[PDB]
Symmetry: C3
Subunit: 104 residues, 3 copies
């Protein structure tokens, strides 16, 4: 059971909830955590840009990571939203079993 976490940055909690709902309804993720009140900073053409966003963490498997990314991207209002995968190298076996059973 090869789990991963997918980080995605949403503009607000409404949007993060809509995104999470979509991917969970398509069984591309087992569950989603939303972390509100994120301040993002970027540096474009000589100027620092600050925004207030929501950090999402979506729990899935390597087999589903691409389709998850593609679905999130499609439904996301941004053209090129942050979508990154981190590996899970360990975890509780029963949890990892539920995570994997949950998926399409």
């Amino acid at each position: 059971p090869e789990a991963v976490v997918v980080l995605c940055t949403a503009p607000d909690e409404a949007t993060a909830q809509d995104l999470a709902a979509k991917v969970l309804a398509e069984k591309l993720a087992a569950c989603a955590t939303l972390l509100p009140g994120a301040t993002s900073l970027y540096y474009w053409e000589g100027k620092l840009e600050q925004e207030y966003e929501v950090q999402m963490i979506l729990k899935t498997t390597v087999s589903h990571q691409q389709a998850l990314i593609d679905c999130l991207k499609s439904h996301h209002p941004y053209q090129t939203p942050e979508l990154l995968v981190l590996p899970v190298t360990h975890g509780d076996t029963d949890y990892l079993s539920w995570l994997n059973a949950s998926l399409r």
Copy 2:
């Protein structure tokens, strides 16, 4: 087949454990316990996280606390077992992510902190 020794996911220098607690009191207690036992070096809490999932055919949204605990690969199983046993849920989220590099002095403190 392929060796990426400076991004070597197979041999972590440290680990970060994600655990979700139902409320802030429980998360502080879970943190206190694993810290006092020297199974993690630091715990970071983010209360008011929202968890979204299907359970029993229905889409839930729950207020929960995101826990981030710092430890080493040698301690990861002991940490997870301790968290799980003390956690009110039977099967809480307990996931471990690899650290492929860390500030030397920090890693020295982390090792010095753990049993």
Copy 3:
């Protein structure tokens, strides 16, 4: 990937992208640190989560602080210079400075992130 290759020979490596975790004592400090590493092009972007609670067990007593969880997006080539920059400007003696590897991601986002460090 976009390589016209047998699926066995596709995606044989991982992105140079990494995420760096650091904790700061307060929002203004976290913002100034982030802005510095960005100005120096040691990260592509920074995400801050203010109003976190950290707990430590130092010298036999549990301690609890309000802190900012920082997550910096960078690459393996820059991870050491980023850490060294954060460390030099951090108020703490031995701040948390940990690199997590990104193993996959949206291609266009990873292209922008790679280009950002140039």
